[PDB]
Design a protein around this ligand. Sequence first.
Ligand SMILES: Cc1csc(NC(=O)c2nc(Sc3nncn3C)ccc2Sc2ccc(F)cc2)n1
Ligand SMILES: OC[C@H]1O[C@H](O)[C@H](O)[C@@H](O)[C@@H]1O
Ligand code: NA
Length: 448
Amino acid sequence: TLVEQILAEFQLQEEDLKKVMRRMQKEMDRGLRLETHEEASVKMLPTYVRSTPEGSEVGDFLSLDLGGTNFRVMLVKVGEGEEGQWSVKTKHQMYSIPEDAMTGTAEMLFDYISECISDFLDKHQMKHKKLPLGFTFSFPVRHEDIDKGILLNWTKGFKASGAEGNNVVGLLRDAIKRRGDFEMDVVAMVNDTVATMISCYYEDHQCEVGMIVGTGCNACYMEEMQNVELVEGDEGRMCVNTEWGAFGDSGELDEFLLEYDRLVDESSANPGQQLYEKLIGGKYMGELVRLVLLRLVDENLLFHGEASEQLRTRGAFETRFVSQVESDTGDRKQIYNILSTLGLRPSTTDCDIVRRACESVSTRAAHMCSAGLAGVINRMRESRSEDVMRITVGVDGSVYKLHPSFKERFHASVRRLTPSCEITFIESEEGSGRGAALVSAVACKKAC
Ligand SMILES: Cc1csc(NC(=O)c2nc(Sc3nncn3C)ccc2Sc2ccc(F)cc2)n1
Ligand SMILES: OC[C@H]1O[C@H](O)[C@H](O)[C@@H](O)[C@@H]1O
Ligand code: NA
């Protein structure tokens, strides 16, 4: 109970979720209107991907995915299916980004990318060949069009200098021609939320929302063009990138924030930014548990009040440990091994307490996230006039997919928040690469 009292600070009651949900909805309305879009914590970024596309090129596309710790390059075949296009990933390669490539400059970093792009084409006897390129770029962009937008700021710990405020598709077309080697048509830059959503479209036309819960956390959804005030027009729909990670940056979550959150935030690459994402994202989840653990050792409640050197270092409680702790079957061997690897020697009760600390943090992430998506879905409910709104959500990300109970918890809570909606969840297969291509495919019918 001294332990359980510390942990019970993580609880959220239903009315707390409803409050977060309504505030999210308010913020979303603000980012859409011209008079408030600029100060809005929830950016609601038009993406220029639009409804009833009809008219796709077929064949082969190059997909890049940048936003993970590791950059990826892959080849995707789009072709012709019934009432839409099929797609399949055929070749792939993943590339690490070195400490020096990151902390450098954007043009530096975008060379490293073009390098990897050459590297990849060499290995597949394709360097001669010229294909449309799908770019999945998982960071907030203000788009002018489907193939043009400026990065607003880096998130999830990225930090290349001289990239913020510049045209990303610009930065890439540049560096692909400090190469001469190869030439791609850069037909479409998308967010990873948008890509996952599109990657599920062929199998389910009701998929109108894309969610990521991985390193970072965010969603996009199909919005009515009359509500998209930042894009001229009233006919049809356009996907909006909510960028809901930055919910709380105007102080909307201040009553919920705990000490561990103010610490994670204060020592992050982006102090004061991405507050909501910091409650949920796998970049921050293990760190939260760490701090909760260090709190517990300080009150002398855990490890006899003695912490290891690993435990006292940032980043050392990896999010994947949280998830592995919660897969422990009851014998404590997974917990013991993780803690032992961290230079600790837990007792039976130290183990049980580490488990509970993990559950506390990841259950609050599930619930917080559930209110976000209930916000998006109930907002869209207003513009639908069926008895039950049947909607499909495409989802990706290792927190959602692999944490043993995250998705169950998430599902039940979202359902509780969204009466008269019947929500179907699809886990995306090669969301990023196959969705970037599918959209490239469609934007080709115009820019080719
Ligand atoms: C201006 C512009 C450039 S690309 C673009 N739109 C797309 O590429 C696109 N958009 C949607 S919007 C939507 N409507 N209801 C729900 N969803 C999500 C849906 C699909 C696609 S591609 C596709 C098409 C068919 C298929 F089987 C698989 C992928 N507009
Ligand atoms: O990768 C998931 C998300 O992480 C961060 O929130 C980014 O700002 C966003 O653009 C992306 O969708
Ligand atoms: Na509009």
